[PDB]
Amino acid sequence: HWGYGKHNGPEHWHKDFPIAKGERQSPVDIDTHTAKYDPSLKPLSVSYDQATSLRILNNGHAFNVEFDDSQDKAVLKGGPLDGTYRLIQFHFHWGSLDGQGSEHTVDKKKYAAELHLVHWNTKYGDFGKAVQQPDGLAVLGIFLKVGSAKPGLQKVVDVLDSIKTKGKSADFTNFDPRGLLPESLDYWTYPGSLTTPPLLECVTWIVLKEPISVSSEQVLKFRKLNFNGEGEPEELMVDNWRPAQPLKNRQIKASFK
Ligand SMILES: [Hg+2]
Ligand SMILES: [Zn+2]
């Protein structure tokens, strides 16, 4: 099926998923001199105090930290969003080298990795229904650069050994996503899509300007993951990012200036 290699990668996705060439595809390049400050943006509200993680899963493309979304707990609201969006999972995209890995780019700059915290609009009852709606999802995107270690990421790093291959999962309770947030909540926002098939055009993107710094040894451990299933030829899980897609006259707004 779809992947990131030469024969099943982003350039092939359009065949099974025609929407790959659609009008609001993600990621995009954020041209900082074209994005306009928007005075009508409300303050962004990230409320992760009562977040309840359940488990971590290697799905053969990335790893997802999944949350219990059966109650209103970890929610994103404010900014460009109307109503309340519930955290369901987070995952990352990363490179084989520090000079690449992010999906969004900033004035064509690629970061070492990108964190996606995926939330669904609670007016639609659940995730599956939300992804049938143009405002069904909100994704908080956070860039990763290589420098000082991120202490709040280490619990994730340490569990990766138990989920090396496609299909493996581990109990992952009491993880606090607040340990993954940078100081500032300044952001760019635009309407877009999921960056993995089925590439559904249901996302309000909120991409934070301030990256988090992770250590070289932290990202190195990301790179020890496998795309393949256990007992199969080893294919390192690296470069699981989709490159920037056409903006198509969409408007990127900034929360700051
Ligand atoms: Hg949609
Ligand atoms: Zn993602």
Short mmCIF file of C-alpha atoms in Angstrom, two decimals, residues 13-250:
data_model
loop_
_atom_site.label_atom_id
_atom_site.label_comp_id
_atom_site.label_asym_id
_atom_site.label_seq_id
_atom_site.Cartn_x
_atom_site.Cartn_y
_atom_site.Cartn_z
CA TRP A 13 -0.67 8.75 -3.69
CA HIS A 14 -2.91 10.50 -6.25
CA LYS A 15 -3.74 7.19 -7.99
CA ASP A 16 -5.61 5.65 -5.01
CA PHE A 17 -6.43 9.04 -3.46
CA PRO A 18 -7.38 11.56 -6.24
CA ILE A 19 -7.76 14.30 -3.62
CA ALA A 20 -3.91 14.40 -3.48
CA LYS A 21 -4.14 17.00 -6.28
CA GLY A 22 -7.06 18.80 -4.61
CA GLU A 23 -7.72 22.45 -3.76
CA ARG A 24 -6.74 22.43 -0.04
CA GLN A 25 -3.91 19.94 0.34
CA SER A 26 -1.31 19.94 3.13
CA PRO A 27 1.45 20.60 4.00
CA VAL A 28 2.37 23.96 2.44
CA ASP A 29 5.26 26.38 2.58
CA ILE A 30 4.57 29.26 4.95
CA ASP A 31 5.81 32.39 3.22
CA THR A 32 6.15 34.70 6.23
CA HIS A 33 6.09 37.86 4.09
CA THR A 34 2.80 36.84 2.43
CA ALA A 35 0.97 35.72 5.61
CA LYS A 36 -1.10 38.55 7.10
CA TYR A 37 -1.67 39.34 10.78
CA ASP A 38 -5.34 38.83 11.58
CA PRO A 39 -6.81 41.13 14.29
CA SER A 40 -10.05 39.08 14.39
CA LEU A 41 -8.28 35.98 15.74
CA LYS A 42 -9.23 35.17 19.34
CA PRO A 43 -6.55 33.98 21.77
CA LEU A 44 -5.65 30.31 21.19
CA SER A 45 -6.68 28.00 24.05
CA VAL A 46 -4.83 24.71 24.62
CA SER A 47 -6.24 22.82 27.62
CA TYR A 48 -4.30 19.61 28.16
CA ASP A 49 -4.48 19.39 32.00
CA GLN A 50 -6.85 16.39 32.13
CA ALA A 51 -5.46 14.57 29.06
CA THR A 52 -5.67 10.78 29.21
CA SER A 53 -3.28 8.84 27.00
CA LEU A 54 -4.04 5.15 26.42
CA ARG A 55 -1.32 3.63 24.27
CA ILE A 56 1.35 3.97 21.61
CA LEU A 57 1.23 2.24 18.24
CA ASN A 58 3.61 1.76 15.32
CA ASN A 59 1.22 1.80 12.35
CA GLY A 60 3.92 1.18 9.74
CA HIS A 61 4.19 4.88 8.79
CA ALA A 62 4.72 6.62 12.15
CA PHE A 63 3.77 6.09 15.80
CA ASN A 64 0.51 7.39 17.26
CA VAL A 65 0.04 8.26 20.93
CA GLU A 66 -3.70 7.72 21.30
CA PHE A 67 -5.92 9.43 23.85
CA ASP A 68 -9.22 8.65 25.50
CA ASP A 69 -11.58 11.10 23.76
CA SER A 70 -14.85 9.73 25.25
CA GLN A 71 -15.14 12.78 27.53
CA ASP A 72 -14.30 16.47 27.08
CA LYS A 73 -10.77 16.56 28.51
CA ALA A 74 -7.84 17.62 26.29
CA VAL A 75 -9.35 20.36 24.08
CA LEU A 76 -8.22 22.97 21.56
CA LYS A 77 -10.36 26.09 21.13
CA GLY A 78 -10.08 29.79 20.24
CA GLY A 79 -7.88 31.22 17.49
CA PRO A 80 -9.50 30.51 14.09
CA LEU A 81 -11.69 27.76 15.61
CA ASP A 82 -15.39 27.94 16.36
CA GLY A 83 -16.45 25.63 19.18
CA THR A 84 -14.46 22.84 20.83
CA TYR A 85 -12.02 20.31 19.33
CA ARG A 86 -10.96 17.17 21.24
CA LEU A 87 -7.48 15.65 21.19
CA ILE A 88 -7.52 12.10 19.79
CA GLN A 89 -3.87 11.35 18.99
CA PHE A 90 -0.45 12.76 18.29
CA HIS A 91 2.36 11.66 15.96
CA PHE A 92 5.46 13.03 14.29
CA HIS A 93 7.08 13.21 10.88
CA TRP A 94 10.88 13.15 10.75
CA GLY A 95 13.91 12.89 8.49
CA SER A 96 16.87 10.61 7.89
CA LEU A 97 19.03 13.68 8.61
CA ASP A 98 18.59 16.84 10.77
CA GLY A 99 18.30 19.05 7.65
CA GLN A 100 14.92 17.52 6.72
CA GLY A 101 11.81 15.98 8.24
CA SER A 102 9.13 18.65 8.75
CA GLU A 103 6.06 18.74 6.55
CA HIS A 104 5.32 22.45 6.71
CA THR A 105 8.23 24.70 5.84
CA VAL A 106 8.87 28.33 6.82
CA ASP A 107 10.27 30.45 3.97
CA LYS A 108 11.35 27.08 2.48
CA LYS A 109 13.23 26.14 5.71
CA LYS A 110 12.82 22.45 6.68
CA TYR A 111 13.02 21.50 10.37
CA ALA A 112 14.28 18.17 11.72
CA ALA A 113 10.77 16.97 12.59
CA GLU A 114 7.14 18.02 13.02
CA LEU A 115 4.64 17.10 15.75
CA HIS A 116 0.95 16.84 14.88
CA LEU A 117 -1.63 16.95 17.68
CA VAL A 118 -4.90 15.89 16.04
CA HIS A 119 -8.26 17.10 17.39
CA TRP A 120 -11.84 16.60 16.19
CA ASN A 121 -14.78 19.06 16.28
CA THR A 122 -17.08 17.85 19.07
CA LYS A 123 -20.19 19.13 17.15
CA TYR A 124 -19.81 16.08 14.91
CA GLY A 125 -20.02 13.47 17.68
CA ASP A 126 -16.87 11.51 16.80
CA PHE A 127 -13.71 11.37 14.64
CA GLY A 128 -15.18 9.32 11.78
CA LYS A 129 -18.02 11.79 11.24
CA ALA A 130 -15.73 14.81 11.73
CA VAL A 131 -13.56 13.73 8.74
CA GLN A 132 -16.61 14.07 6.46
CA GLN A 133 -16.76 17.81 7.27
CA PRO A 134 -14.72 20.78 5.97
CA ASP A 135 -14.27 21.97 9.61
CA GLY A 136 -14.14 18.52 11.20
CA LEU A 137 -10.52 18.65 12.37
CA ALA A 138 -7.91 20.92 13.93
CA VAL A 139 -4.22 20.00 13.94
CA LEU A 140 -1.69 21.81 16.12
CA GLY A 141 1.64 21.60 14.30
CA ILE A 142 4.88 22.03 16.21
CA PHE A 143 8.33 22.10 14.59
CA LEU A 144 11.26 20.21 16.06
CA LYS A 145 14.89 21.29 15.88
CA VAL A 146 18.03 19.54 17.14
CA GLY A 147 19.63 21.12 20.23
CA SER A 148 18.87 20.71 23.93
CA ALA A 149 16.83 17.68 25.01
CA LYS A 150 13.09 17.99 25.50
CA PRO A 151 12.44 16.44 28.95
CA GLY A 152 8.71 16.02 28.26
CA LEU A 153 9.53 13.87 25.19
CA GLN A 154 11.77 11.29 26.91
CA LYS A 155 8.90 9.02 28.05
CA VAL A 156 7.98 8.68 24.35
CA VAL A 157 11.62 8.09 23.38
CA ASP A 158 12.02 5.33 26.02
CA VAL A 159 8.97 3.35 24.88
CA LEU A 160 10.01 3.19 21.18
CA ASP A 161 12.07 0.01 21.74
CA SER A 162 8.87 -1.90 22.61
CA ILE A 163 7.15 -0.80 19.39
CA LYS A 164 9.98 -1.20 16.87
CA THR A 165 7.93 -2.76 14.06
CA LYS A 166 4.61 -2.30 12.21
CA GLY A 167 1.68 -3.54 14.31
CA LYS A 168 3.34 -3.28 17.73
CA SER A 169 1.67 -1.25 20.46
CA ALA A 170 2.37 -0.59 24.16
CA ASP A 171 0.43 0.65 27.18
CA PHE A 172 1.09 4.37 27.36
CA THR A 173 -0.96 5.91 30.16
CA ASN A 174 -0.47 9.20 32.04
CA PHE A 175 1.49 10.95 29.29
CA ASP A 176 1.19 14.73 29.51
CA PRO A 177 1.19 16.47 26.11
CA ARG A 178 1.88 19.81 27.87
CA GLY A 179 5.54 18.73 28.00
CA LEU A 180 5.72 19.02 24.20
CA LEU A 181 4.65 22.68 23.89
CA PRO A 182 7.00 25.60 23.28
CA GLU A 183 6.68 28.81 25.37
CA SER A 184 4.86 30.92 22.76
CA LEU A 185 1.55 30.07 21.10
CA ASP A 186 2.09 32.47 18.16
CA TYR A 187 0.91 30.63 15.03
CA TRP A 188 0.07 30.64 11.35
CA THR A 189 -3.32 29.22 10.29
CA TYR A 190 -4.80 28.02 7.00
CA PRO A 191 -7.43 25.51 5.80
CA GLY A 192 -5.88 22.21 4.72
CA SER A 193 -5.85 18.43 4.83
CA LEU A 194 -4.47 15.34 6.53
CA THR A 195 -0.94 14.80 5.19
CA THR A 196 -1.29 11.02 4.99
CA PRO A 197 -3.77 9.07 2.85
CA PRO A 198 -6.73 9.42 2.57
CA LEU A 199 -5.58 13.10 2.59
CA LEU A 200 -9.02 14.32 3.68
CA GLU A 201 -9.62 18.07 3.35
CA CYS A 202 -11.05 18.53 6.82
CA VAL A 203 -8.29 20.34 8.74
CA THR A 204 -7.88 23.78 10.23
CA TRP A 205 -4.10 23.96 10.54
CA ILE A 206 -2.57 25.82 13.43
CA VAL A 207 1.22 25.82 13.06
CA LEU A 208 3.25 27.27 15.93
CA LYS A 209 6.07 29.67 15.04
CA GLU A 210 8.32 28.67 17.94
CA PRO A 211 9.95 25.27 17.47
CA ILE A 212 10.78 22.92 20.31
CA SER A 213 14.36 21.70 20.65
CA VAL A 214 15.00 17.96 21.00
CA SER A 215 18.40 16.28 21.47
CA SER A 216 20.30 14.50 18.70
CA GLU A 217 20.05 11.25 20.72
CA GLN A 218 16.24 11.73 20.97
CA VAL A 219 15.75 12.02 17.17
CA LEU A 220 18.26 9.24 16.58
CA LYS A 221 15.93 6.91 18.51
CA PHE A 222 12.98 7.96 16.28
CA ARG A 223 15.19 6.83 13.37
CA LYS A 224 15.63 3.31 14.87
CA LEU A 225 11.94 2.52 14.32
CA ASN A 226 10.90 0.20 11.45
CA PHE A 227 8.33 0.66 8.65
CA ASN A 228 8.32 -3.15 8.21
CA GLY A 229 6.60 -5.71 10.44
CA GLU A 230 8.50 -8.03 12.79
CA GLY A 231 10.46 -10.77 11.01
CA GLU A 232 10.65 -8.74 7.78
CA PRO A 233 13.62 -7.09 5.96
CA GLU A 234 14.59 -3.99 7.94
CA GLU A 235 13.43 -0.69 6.46
CA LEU A 236 14.30 2.17 8.83
CA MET A 237 11.38 4.48 9.68
CA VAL A 238 12.79 7.75 8.32
CA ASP A 239 11.66 10.49 5.95
CA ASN A 240 7.99 9.87 6.64
CA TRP A 241 7.03 13.41 5.58
CA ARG A 242 5.00 14.71 2.65
CA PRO A 243 6.58 17.69 0.88
CA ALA A 244 4.94 21.10 0.49
CA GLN A 245 1.90 21.22 -1.81
CA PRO A 246 0.38 24.04 -3.93
CA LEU A 247 -1.23 26.82 -1.86
CA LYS A 248 -3.83 27.48 -4.62
CA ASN A 249 -4.84 31.03 -3.57
CA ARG A 250 -5.56 29.96 0.03
#
